[PDB]
Amino acid sequence: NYDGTEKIPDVMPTKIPNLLVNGSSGIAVGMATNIPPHNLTEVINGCLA
DNA sequence: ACTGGAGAAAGAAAGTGAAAGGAAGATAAAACGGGATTCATACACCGTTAAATACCGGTTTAAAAATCCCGTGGCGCGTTTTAAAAAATCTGTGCGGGTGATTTTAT
């Protein structure tokens, strides 16, 4: 952490494709993102395919 | 007596709180105009007949149509203005993580 007295995970070991099913939206310097949500069953079927 | 700093007086310029009023808005009461019923009453449709009008044959004649000469103003051309519509260019705004700040009451 900032004081060097704790530990924080670098990334989560997720079982869910969260990015596609929930989307995202943010504004940065020189760029931006905009992603719509989706349906979980269709994403799972696509991953299996 | 003279000098230079400092404090106090006096005077002039700028900011101020309050000002009728008037065009510019805003809000209600009123007069209006457009639908649903309800019939009595005048209007639409059907047989009959005297009468008023359309039609044919032949004149005519006075009025309107046709023709010629001319002298103009009313359209036509070329070149400018001027609004009107269209294309181009600016102005706000909200989505989600970040930085920093404000106010009123009771005992």
Side-chain angles (χ1 to χ4, degrees), chain A residues 18-37:
Chain A
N18 187 28
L19 182 63
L20 283 180
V21 303
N22 274 332
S24 179
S25 179
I27 308 175
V29 179
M31 58 187 62
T33 175
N34 208 20
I35 300 178

Side-chain angles (χ1 to χ4, degrees), chain A residues 2-49:
Chain A
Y2 54 93
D3 284 339
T5 59
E6 296 285 349
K7 290 294 184 178
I8 301 178
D10 182 71
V11 73
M12 292 298 185
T14 173
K15 287 184 172 62
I16 314 296
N18 187 28
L19 182 63
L20 283 180
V21 303
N22 274 332
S24 179
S25 179
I27 308 175
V29 179
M31 58 187 62
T33 175
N34 208 20
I35 300 178
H38 291 79
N39 189 88
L40 185 61
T41 305
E42 303 176 4
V43 178
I44 295 297
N45 294 333
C47 293
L48 292 178

